[PDB]
Amino acid sequence: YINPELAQEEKNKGNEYFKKGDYPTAMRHYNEAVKRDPENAILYSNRAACLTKLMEFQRALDDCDTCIRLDSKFIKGYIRKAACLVAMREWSKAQRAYEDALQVDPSNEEAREGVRNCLR
Numbered sequence: 548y549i550n551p552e553l554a555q556e557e558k559n560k561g562n563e564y565f566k567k568g569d570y571p572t573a574m575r576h577y578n579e580a581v582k583r584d585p586e587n588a589i590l591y592s593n594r595a596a597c598l599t600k601l602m603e604f605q606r607a608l609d610d611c612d613t614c615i616r617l618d619s620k621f622i623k624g625y626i627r628k629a630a631c632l633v634a635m636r637e638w639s640k641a642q643r644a645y646e647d648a649l650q651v652d653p654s655n656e657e658a659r660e661g662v663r664n665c666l667r
Contacts, residue, residue, distance in 0.1 A: 554587060560573075589623070645658045
């Protein structure tokens with residue numbers, strides 16, 4: 548059952564615990580946010596960042612694809628995908644994910660720095 552205000556509230560509990568670095572507890576809240584507004588791309592971007600810190604790389608990249616599917620214009624899905632691949636040391640795939648972001652917005656500074664980071 549869709550509840551987008553509750554999803555927002557849960558997003559924030561998530562983001563807060565993310566920042567005290569208790570990702571276990573942040574994840575409980577990101578899961579609930581996703582449950583309540585499952586078509587909202589940003590919730591998957593957010594959850595992907597957390598899953599990546601936890602080294603749940605398979606689940607992280609699933610969330611990045613979800614984000615990219617739900618909103619192909621939302622740059623952070625591509626950024627989170629690239630960042631996860633950097634965390635995996637998948638450099639060649641990471642470089643292409645950042646380049647996919649740059650296709651969406653060639654002025655994106657985070658993606659341009661990400662390409663620099665991928666030069667080995």
